[PDB]
Amino acid sequence: KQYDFTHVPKRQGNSIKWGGLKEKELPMWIAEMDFRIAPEIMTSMEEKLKVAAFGYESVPAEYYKAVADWEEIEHRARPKEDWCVFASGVVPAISAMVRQFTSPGDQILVQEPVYNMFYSVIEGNGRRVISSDLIYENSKYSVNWADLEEKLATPSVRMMVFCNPHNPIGYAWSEEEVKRIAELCAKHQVLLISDEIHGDLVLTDEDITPAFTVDWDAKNWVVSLISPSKTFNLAALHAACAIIPNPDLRARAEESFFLAGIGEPNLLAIPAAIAAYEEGHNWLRELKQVLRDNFAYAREFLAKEVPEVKVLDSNASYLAWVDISALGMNAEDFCKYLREKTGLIISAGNGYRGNGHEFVRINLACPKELVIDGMQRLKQGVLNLNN
Amino acid sequence: KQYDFTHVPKRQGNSIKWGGLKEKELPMWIAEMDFRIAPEIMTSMEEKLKVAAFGYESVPAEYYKAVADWEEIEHRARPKEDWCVFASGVVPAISAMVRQFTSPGDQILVQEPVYNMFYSVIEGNGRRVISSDLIYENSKYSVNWADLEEKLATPSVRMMVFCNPHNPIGYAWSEEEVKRIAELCAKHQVLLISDEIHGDLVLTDEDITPAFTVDWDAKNWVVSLISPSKTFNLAALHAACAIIPNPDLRARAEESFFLAGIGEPNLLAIPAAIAAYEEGHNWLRELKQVLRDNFAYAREFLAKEVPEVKVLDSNASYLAWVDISALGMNAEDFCKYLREKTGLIISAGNGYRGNGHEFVRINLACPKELVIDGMQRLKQGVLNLNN
Ligand SMILES: Cc1ncc(COP(=O)(O)O)c(C=O)c1O
Ligand SMILES: Cc1ncc(COP(=O)(O)O)c(C=O)c1O
Numbered sequence: 001k002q003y004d005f006t007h008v009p010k011r012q013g014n015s016i017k018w019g020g021l022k023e024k025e026l027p028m029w030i031a032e033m034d035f036r037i038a039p040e041i042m043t044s045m046e047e048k049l050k051v052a053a054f055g056y057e058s059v060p061a062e063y064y065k066a067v068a069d070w071e072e073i074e075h076r077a078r079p080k081e082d083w084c085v086f087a088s089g090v091v092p093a094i095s096a097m098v099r100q101f102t103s104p105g106d107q108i109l110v111q112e113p114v115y116n117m118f119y120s121v122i123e124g125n126g127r128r129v130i131s132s133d134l135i136y137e138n139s140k141y142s143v144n145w146a147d148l149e150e151k152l153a154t155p156s157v158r159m160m161v162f163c164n165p166h167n168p169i170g171y172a173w174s175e176e177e178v179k180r181i182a183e184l185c186a187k188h189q190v191l192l193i194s195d196e197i198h199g200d201l202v203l204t205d206e207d208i209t210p211a212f213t214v215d216w217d218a219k220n221w222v223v224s225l226i227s228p229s230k231t232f233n234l235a236a237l238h239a240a241c242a243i244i245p246n247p248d249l250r251a252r253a254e255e256s257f258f259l260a261g262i263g264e265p266n267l268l269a270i271p272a273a274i275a276a277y278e279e280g281h282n283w284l285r286e287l288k289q290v291l292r293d294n295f296a297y298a299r300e301f302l303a304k305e306v307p308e309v310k311v312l313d314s315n316a317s318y319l320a321w322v323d324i325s326a327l328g329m330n331a332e333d334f335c336k337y338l339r340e341k342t343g344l345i346i347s348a349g350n351g352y353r354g355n356g357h358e359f360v361r362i363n364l365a366c367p368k369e370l371v372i373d374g375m376q377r378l379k380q381g382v383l384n385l386n387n
Numbered sequence: 388k389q390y391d392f393t394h395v396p397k398r399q400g401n402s403i404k405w406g407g408l409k410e411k412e413l414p415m416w417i418a419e420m421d422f423r424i425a426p427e428i429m430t431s432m433e434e435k436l437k438v439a440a441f442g443y444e445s446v447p448a449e450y451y452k453a454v455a456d457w458e459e460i461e462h463r464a465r466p467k468e469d470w471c472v473f474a475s476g477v478v479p480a481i482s483a484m485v486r487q488f489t490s491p492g493d494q495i496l497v498q499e500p501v502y503n504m505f506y507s508v509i510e511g512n513g514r515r516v517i518s519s520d521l522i523y524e525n526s527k528y529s530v531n532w533a534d535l536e537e538k539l540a541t542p543s544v545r546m547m548v549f550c551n552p553h554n555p556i557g558y559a560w561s562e563e564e565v566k567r568i569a570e571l572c573a574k575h576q577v578l579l580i581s582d583e584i585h586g587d588l589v590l591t592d593e594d595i596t597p598a599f600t601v602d603w604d605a606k607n608w609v610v611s612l613i614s615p616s617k618t619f620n621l622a623a624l625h626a627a628c629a630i631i632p633n634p635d636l637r638a639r640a641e642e643s644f645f646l647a648g649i650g651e652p653n654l655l656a657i658p659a660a661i662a663a664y665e666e667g668h669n670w671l672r673e674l675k676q677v678l679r680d681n682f683a684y685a686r687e688f689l690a691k692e693v694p695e696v697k698v699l700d701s702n703a704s705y706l707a708w709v710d711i712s713a714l715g716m717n718a719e720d721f722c723k724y725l726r727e728k729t730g731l732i733i734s735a736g737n738g739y740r741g742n743g744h745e746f747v748r749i750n751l752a753c754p755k756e757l758v759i760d761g762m763q764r765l766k767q768g769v770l771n772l773n774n
Binding site: 030036037056093099235236255260261264266267268270 | 417423625
């Protein structure tokens with residue numbers, strides 16, 4: 001290993017994951033890593049600070065080239081550089097496109113259970129969430145394609161926020177899955193917002209199919225959203241990119257970003273994202289080895305010692321989605337009890353809606369010692385409910 | 388001098404002010420400085436990068452306490468910390484509050500000539516600009532109070548965006564003026580948005596009266612917006628703060644910031660803004676003397692060498708508002724010609740509406756060597772018109 005995946009970075013006091021924690025508490029909930037970032041990214045940030053003045057910045061061509069090269073090398077899918085639009089973050093970008101591309105009262109389709117912020121930005125903006133729930137049978141989720149299409153074909157359903165890879169279940173959709181969803185959207189004149197923030201984190205030999213790769217019958221109805229945030233542990237960098245093949249939709253999205261105040265990079269976003277996308281390949285390769293090892297440990301350990309929970313098969317993300325239905329306890333109550341009894345803090349599934357009240361979500365992007373600790377604490381919590 | 392005000396910071400290529408220039412061009416248009424930032428802010432950024440991991444961050448109580456301390460020490464006007472809400476930018480905060488507190492088609496009052504982004508955020512959001520124009524007589528601007536009140540009393544006039552100190556004329560309103568405008572707004576149930584981003588840059592012995600200091604007859608109708616960005620040359624830091632005494636308005640504004648994606652700090656906003664507001668007093672004191680020296684130089688040089696222009700008397704900001712009406716040329720025509728013939732790039736006043744076509748705006752926040760160069764180029768451009 002050329003990089004450090006053993007030492008937990010010591011945060012300042014306002015960290016959400018680590019701030020204000022009792023002693024020995026173990027946070028494994030919010031989706032950020034307990035690894036130092038790639039030193040090539042750190043080098044770029046430290047070089048930028050040498051300017052020692054931080055006035056207004058433009059988005060350089062080098063930024064879009066870096067995004068396009070990254071998508072080509074890592075995902076065999078090069079976007080055209082002119083498809084790319086900087087935004088300060090994925091969820092702010094979705095929020096702006098909700099306002100620009102739908103009207104108040106319109107419905108926006110998601111596939112529950114899904115990332116909670118999708119509901120916040122839809123409902124907070126005065127749009128209405130509609131779900132084609134994922135079907136859960138035999139420890140696997142699947143799409144009810146007829147229901148999905150009937151909902152997309154509804155006149156007031158105007159946008160689909162598609163989570164690709166899907167958070168929290170950790171599923172990188174197949175090529176014909178993505179192509180089918182895009183064709184359904186296009187046929188029914190629905191804009192497909194493809195949130196691909198987990199796209200660099202496919203752990204099997206499968207890979208992401210970005211929405212921008214679908215053929216031109218449908219490519220004019222898609223937006224791909226990417227960011228180095230999840231991949232490189234850079235949530236607070238506020239650097240993202242919308243990839244929008246449709247030139248007019250693209251320009252409208254850009255204008256909505258500027259009006260909302262999310263179209264201009266902060267003092268680090270451009271050099272740091274360029275460094276990640278140009279020089280982060282080796283660090284990501286080693287990261288995936290660590291994550292595969294951590295998932296292998298969690299799956300082997302919970303299969304052997306905690307048969308009352310079921311880690312779902314997932315091919316993407318560093319988040320494990322764990323069926324706790326056999327405990328007969330609402331996930332929020334269980335997570336509260338588990339924290340009080342063991343100090344382990346994991347995410348209750350309820351906020352993802354769908355059938356999330358039967359699940360917990362566990363963040364495995366930390367050093368293996370923390371994974372070993374956390375799994376034992378989860379075992380302790382499950383078996384002491386038995387008493 | 389303890390600090391460096393002679394060396395221009397060496398920017399990277401994607402700078403709005405210094406990027407894409409031709410040989411020997413001298414930019415003095417956009418409002419950012421050509422000074423290094425205070426070393427106390429610089430160190431806080433360098434130390435924060437050492438965390439080497441940038442996940443999610445809360446806004447700590449210490450941020451609002453630093454805002455309160457700064458306002459108390461610099462302006463003798465201590466806001467209650469509970470009034471304060473982080474936002475990533477002043478103009479984005481105005482944009483969010485336009486959408487939250489007015490309806491499409493409603494009128495929003497400004498005082499022309501005024502900062503061009505006021506028009507952008509009002510009209511881009513589908514609201515209508517109404518102006519109570521500042522009256523311009525004898526090289527000074529004044530308020531038509533009857534006209535202002537008549538417009539505020541119009542039912543469709545729902546918000547006033549108040550520039551305090553006023554850009555581009557560089558005028559810090561008197562206490563009586565701020566209180567009078569606030570009471571007019573409250574009397575007619577108009578929300579007063581007081582943009583105080585220039586409030587730390589009063590160059591005379593006068594000071595700003597922040598809107599949040601008005602008495603409670605009217606304090607429930609005001610929002611004060613502040614930021615270290617103008618004061619400390621931190622446009623790209625994306626740290627600002629709304630001060631909203633009314634708790635119901637405060638709750639609604641805070642939710643609007645979160646929905647727009649401007650309510651959460653990037654990786655540097657918190658420690659850098661805190662260092663600025665806790666340790667930037669001495670640097671700002673030295674900056675103000677450098678700015679006064681540059682304004683003194685420019686006024687004396689232009690009075691002696693270019694009597695065809697008149698630098699207006701101003702008490703705030705580092706932007707000179709220069710009456711070019713004696714040149715007999717539209718400011719946009721003059722500034723184009725000036726850049727072509729001399730390479731000096733200043734702002735045409737046309738974008739500020741009002742009587743801005745008779746003015747240019749010149750940024751004096753740069754080393755004296757650049758002020759001398761810029762003044763000579765401006766003289767040469769004036770000289771070459773009647774040749
Ligand atoms: C599916 C998904 N989208 C978006 C985000 C957050 O993205 P950003 O912080 O750039 O807004 C997350 C959280 O990591 C996520 O899981
Ligand atoms: C009056 C005024 N308001 C707002 C701004 C922009 O501030 P921010 O970048 O924090 O949105 C400026 C830029 O100098 C300004 O002059």
